[PDB]
Amino acid sequence: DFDSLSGTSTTWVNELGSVMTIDVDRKGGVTGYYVNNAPGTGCRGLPYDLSGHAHGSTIAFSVVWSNGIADCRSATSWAGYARKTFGGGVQIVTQWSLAFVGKAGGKIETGQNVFTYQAATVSESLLTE
Amino acid sequence: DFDSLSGTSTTWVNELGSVMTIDVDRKGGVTGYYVNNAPGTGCRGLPYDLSGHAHGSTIAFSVVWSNGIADCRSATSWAGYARKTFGGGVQIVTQWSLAFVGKAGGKIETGQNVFTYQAATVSESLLTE
Amino acid sequence: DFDSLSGTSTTWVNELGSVMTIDVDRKGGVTGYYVNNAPGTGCRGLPYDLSGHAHGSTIAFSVVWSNGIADCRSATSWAGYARKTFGGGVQIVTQWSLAFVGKAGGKIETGQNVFTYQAATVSESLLTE
Amino acid sequence: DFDSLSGTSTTWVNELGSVMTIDVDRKGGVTGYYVNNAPGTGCRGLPYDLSGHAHGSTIAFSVVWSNGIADCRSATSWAGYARKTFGGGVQIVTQWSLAFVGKAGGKIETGQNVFTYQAATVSESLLTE
Amino acid sequence: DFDSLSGTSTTWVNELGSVMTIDVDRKGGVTGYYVNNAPGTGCRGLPYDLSGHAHGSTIAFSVVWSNGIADCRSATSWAGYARKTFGGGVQIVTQWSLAFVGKAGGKIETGQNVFTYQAATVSESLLTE
Amino acid sequence: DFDSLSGTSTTWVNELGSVMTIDVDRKGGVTGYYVNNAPGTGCRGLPYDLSGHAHGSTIAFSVVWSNGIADCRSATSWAGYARKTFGGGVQIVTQWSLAFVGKAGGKIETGQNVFTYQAATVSESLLTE
Amino acid sequence: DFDSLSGTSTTWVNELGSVMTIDVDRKGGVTGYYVNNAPGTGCRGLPYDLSGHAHGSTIAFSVVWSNGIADCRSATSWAGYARKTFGGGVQIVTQWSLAFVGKAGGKIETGQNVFTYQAATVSESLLTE
Amino acid sequence: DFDSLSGTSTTWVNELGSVMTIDVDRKGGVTGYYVNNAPGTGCRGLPYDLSGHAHGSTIAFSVVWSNGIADCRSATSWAGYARKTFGGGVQIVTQWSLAFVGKAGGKIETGQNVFTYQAATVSESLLTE
Amino acid sequence: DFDSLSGTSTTWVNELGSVMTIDVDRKGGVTGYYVNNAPGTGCRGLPYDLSGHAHGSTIAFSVVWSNGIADCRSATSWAGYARKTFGGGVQIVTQWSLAFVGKAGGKIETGQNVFTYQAATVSESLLTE
Amino acid sequence: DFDSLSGTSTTWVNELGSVMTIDVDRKGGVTGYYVNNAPGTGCRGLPYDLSGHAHGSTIAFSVVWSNGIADCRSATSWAGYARKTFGGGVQIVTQWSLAFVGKAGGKIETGQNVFTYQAATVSESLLTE
Secondary structure (H helix, E strand, O other): HHHHOEEEEEEEEEEEEEEEEEEOOOOEEEOOOOOOOOOOOOOOEEEEEEEEEEEEEEEEEEEEEOOOOOOOOOOEEEEEEEEEEOOOEEEEEEEEEEEEOOOOOOOOEEEEEEEEOOEEEOOOOOOOO | HHHHHHHHEEEEOOOOOOOEEEEEEEOOEEEEEEEEEOOOOOOOOOOEEEEEOOOEEEEEEEEEEEOOOOOEEEEEEEEEEEEEOOOOOEEEEEEEEEEEEEEEEEEEEEEEEEEEEEEEEEOOOOOOO | OHHHEEEEEEEOOOOOOEEEEEEEEOOOOOEEEEEOOOOOOOOOOOEEEEEEEEEEEEEEEEEEEEEEOOEEEEEEEEEEEEEEEEEOEEEEEEEEEEEEOOOEEEEEEEEEEEEEEEOOOEEEOOOOO | OOOHHOOEEEEEEEOOOEEEEEOOOOEEEEEEEEEEEOOOOOOOOOOEEEEEEEEOOOEEEEEEEEEEEEEEEEEEEEEEEEEEEOOEEEEEEEEEEEEEEEOOOOEEEEEEEEEEEOOOEEEEOOOOO | OOHHEOEEEEEEEEOOOOOOEEOOOOOOEEEEEEEEEOOOOOOOOOOOEEEEEOOOEEEEEEEEEEEEOOEEEEEEEEEEEEEEEEEOOEEEEEEEEEEEEEEEEEEEEEEEEEEEEEEEEEOOOOOOO | OHHHHOOEEEEEOOHHHHOOOOOOOOOOOEEEEEEOOOOOOOOOOOOOOOOOOOOOOOEEEEEEEEEEOEEEEEEEEEEEEEEOOOEEEEEEEEEEEEEEOOOEEEEEEEEEEEEEOOOOOOOOOOOOO | OHHHOEEEEEEEEEEOOEEEEEEOOOOOOOEEEOOOOOOOOOOOOEEEEEEEEEOOOOEEEEEEEEEEEEEEEEEEEEEEEEEEEOOEEEEEEEEEEEEEEEEEEEEEEEEEEEEEEOOEEOOOOOOOO | OHHHHHEEEEEEEOOOOOEEEEEOOOEEEEEEEEEEEOOOOOOOOOEEEEEEEEOOOEEEEEEEOOOOEEEEEEEEEEEEEEEEEEEOOHHHHEEEEEEEEEEEEEEEEEEEEEEEEEOOEOOOOOHHH | OOOOOOOEEEEEOOOOOEEEEEEEEOOOOOEEEOOOOOOOOOOOOEEEEEEEEEOEEEEEEEEOOOOOEEEEEEEEEEEEEEEEEEEEOOOOOOOEEEEEOOOEEEEEEEEEEEEEEEEEEEOOOOOOO | OOOHHHHEEEEOOOOOOOEEEEOOOOOOOEEEEEEEEOOOOOOOOEEEEEEEEEEEOOOEEEEOOOOOEEEEEEEEEEEEEEEEEEEOOEEEEEEEHHHEEEEOOEEEEEEEEEEEOOOOOEOOOOOOO
16 A cells, blocks of 8 residues: 555665655655666656555556756656555566657557565665664 | 747646646656546546656656546556647647556557647637637 | 535536536635536536625526637626435526627527536446446 | 726616626726616615626626615626727626526516626716716 | 624615625724715716724724716715614614815715614515515 | 825825825726824834725725734725925825724714925935935 | 843833834844934934834844925934833933034934833723823 | 846955955845954954845944854944945945944944955965866 | 855765765755665665755765655664765765664664766667667 | 664754754655864865765765855765764764865865764853854
């Protein structure tokens, strides 16, 4: 249930190391940012604005790949559902669609990502875990 | 082409007669509503909130299927590119993803829609075209 | 009795399957939208703004048939009374007036509509009720 | 054209001496007041809130008959079209519906009223024309 | 005590049928409207802006006779005191001054008007008491 | 003519040496203060709020004699006309009404005041003109 | 004692009948007006803007002798302490400095004023104490 | 002329090294801070809020000696005039009054300060002029 | 010179591949974020808020290593100067200090970083650079 | 721990007698000012704006040595940790870096400062401590 994230900020990591941090407001409005870490892609390593909406067990969100720093002239959107995992964990199973303009005109690709909730961590220092 | 929708409201209809009306602000922020007319689906015939972002020839938007009237407990997201058609027409080619929870657990489906720009119509009367 | 709708959003369907969603504020101000399904009319299947006022058992509201998508160069106004249905349901019994300007010039029609309150619904998924 | 009334206040009088003073904003939103002077009615001689909408040659507006002074537990709505008269006068041709609840139960009447635009006047003093 | 009228709207009628509807705020600020029904005067039957101030048992208020509809090129001001009548009625006993400019030059008349509080009424319908 | 006072602050003295400073806004709204010097009156030598309206050659304003320092349980209202003085000066010829509640109860007096416009002055120092 | 003037307006009069009305906010910010009644001085009889600050038993305030009506091209500032007098009265003992430009060039004078708190008075009428 | 400081920030130093930095707005409102460096005084070396008013050649301002850091339970006010000095300089000649509460009750002292305008300086580094 | 950065957003990379994006306001206020890439450090790959100030040829900014995702219980501050590179480029030569608390209590380390200005880039797609 | 400083304003002095006053917000945002006392430095005795961040046991803050009065073309940043003193006191142990531009170009110096928390004080008067 994404309604229990109402007024929280949570971070989620997919199988390729890409990260999203999402703020879900009381109406289920989703804001935050996405850091792309996917091998073979541009617009890696810096925050891109993310927005969408969540209700019950389902969520949809999109990122346009332009942040004033690197513009990949592309758009991704995700939809997914929450599922609980063995001994207290939580994930979002998603399908994405990516749109862009190749030399050969428009193209669109799709794929799955599973995003795993990452609890906030505390280390001893910047130098030592 | 999507930057030149700056400060405009535009309507687009897909192959199944589903309608989206979108407001695109100067920063490429997308708001408006979607009306689902897709045979075999719930949440038909009434505006649902739509949001996302447009930048180049690309756009990404989401709808959560809850409006206070009918809740299908599902979420759709689209990513698309603009193309002109012979005629001086404009279409958005899109791929979508749909997430929901069956009795079987969560599932996701994908598909294409092409949305065609519909220019504003004027009739003689409510009774006569 | 409409004072009890203060701060609420309620959906109503008429004998033609036309649907409105009205918001009644603390002072009896009515806003919301109307989706027309009347056979042999234009301006069907999309929201049009509505406004009026309600006090006690009576209500009056108006729709101008222009929403930036389809202009039928017409306006409808309704006046009605609330009546409890056997059980705990509620209807609005209305008389409407329709004004338009055709090739024959200005005309006015009248008729009755009975609106029935429809509580919110929840389905399993967008595909399965 | 009620579009030409954008940013204007205009006063209109019907064949029974009843008056409407309306403000049309740049989106066609109608606000103002109605003064009922119809022989044999209540709620006479004093302003009631009026709201509605105008576009092109058509207008619709509503008055609930409660202003904190006299409550006739009724609602009127009007739909009309503009017509030009010889002399450069302008009229709103309307059909109205009036809803009320007698000890009889709910009732609705209908009727026509033509509203004639009244140009602003300047008199010598409060005591002489 | 006009202090007891804090946050209230009240309507008062004088011996010629003229009406004032006033709002007294918590600092004694008076706003509202005046409807002139005096035989043999202009600026009749429609609201003019009224402003002034009330404290304890005294009140003063002004109407300029220009409302964008009829301009009688005149100004009235009133000063008065409250008095209770047998039955729990309340009256404002006023002296007024009226200034205007005839082809004669400037002129000022004076007079008395007693304003009687009119309690809010509820009638069966617009058509019957 | 008072429309030409739009956006101005102007000071005026009467035959008793009472002074008012009025601010007339674009719509003819009058605000400011009144300093009373009338012999044999209380509430002398300190500002009291004033409000009213001016249009064309006429004006009406009011002072309630309570300013949190001295309450004389009274209200004065003025109505008057502007008249140009030989040269380029200007006066307001007013009739006032005064209402108060004494040990004999409610009373109303009337009289005339003529206000003369006084332009701003500059001295050398607080000690030497 | 000056902290307990928090959210109050208070009037004080000096030995020469000069008056200051001061508003003290929760932070000790002082606003209001001063009326000069000092024999031998210009800018007499009308409010001038006063500001400064109060904290303990101490206060400091300033008046610039320009109000849009009479400009004496001078500035006074006061510093003072509160003291109670036998009676349950309250005074502010002050020292002032006055700056101006004579034909001789700039000069500054100093002096004491004691200001006495005047409680709000109520009279029977404007005519009768 | 302090009117030529309208919307500037300027710094001034007196014979004892005390500093004031004042912002004069378009109406002659004075805000900023004072740093006390006077031998034999508390509340030295840190900013205290200053406010007052300037017009033509004269200025008045006050400082209360409480900043949340050191409270000397004292108030100073200044009045002065501007004068030009040999080869382009500018000063403010002031008289101050200081109020405080000694063991022996309230006391007040006065004296002169001349404040000299200090032009903004630029050094090579924090280490070298 | 960093005053040429007024109203700009600029991205900078150091010799370790750490990147900051800084917003310099018209007053030289610096905000933005830092993404850490230093070998053997925690808090890597995600934005941390940064703030400081810039004027002429010098800048100073700080990061606390807590962003709600990974808290390394540390703080870094930089001071630096602007160095123009052969051919229109720009570098910030900085000294940093890192404060943290280990098992043996508080520690501080220091070192040098050189930041290079990186203009925005545009790729063909998210897939091809 | 600096999170106990949320919503507080606190003054701190170092071994050279330099003083800062810092405002820590509920999010650990630091603002305030620094007054420099270091021997052989310019920009002494007057406030310079300071900003940075604090969380848990660490803080980082910066000052640019330009305040409109004295520009030393330099910037200092500090990083430090909180150290509880025997008996309820608190110190910030800091390392600073100073960047400036001399005749031989950019230079950076570094060193240590220990800040001690100084609670607010109250003197009897500005004259006696």
